[PDB]
Structure 1
Amino acid sequence: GAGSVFRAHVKHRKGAARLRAVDFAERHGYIKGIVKDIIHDPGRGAPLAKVVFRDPYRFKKRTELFIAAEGIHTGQFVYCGKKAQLNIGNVLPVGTMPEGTIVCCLEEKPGDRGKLARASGNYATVISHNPETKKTRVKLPSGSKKVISSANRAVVGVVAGGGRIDKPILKAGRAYHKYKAKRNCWPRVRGVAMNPVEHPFGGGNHQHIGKPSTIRRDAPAGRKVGLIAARRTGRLRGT
Structure 2
Amino acid sequence: PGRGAPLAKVVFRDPYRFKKRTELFIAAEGIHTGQFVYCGKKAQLNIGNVLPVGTMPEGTIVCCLEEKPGDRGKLARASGNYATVISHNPETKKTRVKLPSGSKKVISSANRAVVGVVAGGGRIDKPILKAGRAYHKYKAKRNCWPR
Count of residues paired in the alignment: 145
SS at match of 2:8: strand
Q: What does the per-residue CA deviation read over 1:115-149, in whole Å, with 9 as the maximum and x for residues that have no partner?
A: 01111111111111111111111101111111001
| 8 A contact 2:3–2:141 mirrored in 1 | no
Deviation at 1:44, TM superposition (A): 2.4
Farther off after superposition, 103-112 or 170-179 = 170-179
Separation in 2, partners of 1:138, 1:51 = 27
Q: What does the per-residue CA deviation read over 1:146-199, in whole Å, with 9 as the maximum and x for residues that have no partner?
A: 10011101000011100101221120121111111122111xxxxxxxxxxxxx
Q: Which runs of 5+ in 1 are unaligned?
A: 1-41, 187-239
Q: What does the per-residue CA deviation read over 1:75-108, in whole Å, with 9 as the maximum and x for residues that have no partner?
A: 1111111111111111001111101010000011
Aligned residues: CA RMSD: 1.0
Separation in 2, partners of 1:91, 1:114 = 11
Q: Which runs of 5+ in 2 are unaligned?
A: none
Separation in 2, partners of 1:107, 1:44 = 21
Separation in 2, partners of 1:132, 1:60 = 41
The alignment-based identity, stated in percent, is 100
Separation in 2, partners of 1:153, 1:44 = 24
Separation in 1, partners of 2:130, 2:3 = 21
Larger RCO, structures 1/2 (Cα 8 Å, 6+ apart): 2
SS at match of 2:136: helix
Separation in 1, partners of 2:57, 2:90 = 11
Q: Which residue of 1 aligns with 2:129?
A: 170
SS at match of 1:77: coil
Q: What is the TM-score when the length of structure 1 is the normalising length? A: 0.59
Report runs of 4+ in structure 1 exceeding 4 Å deviation.
none
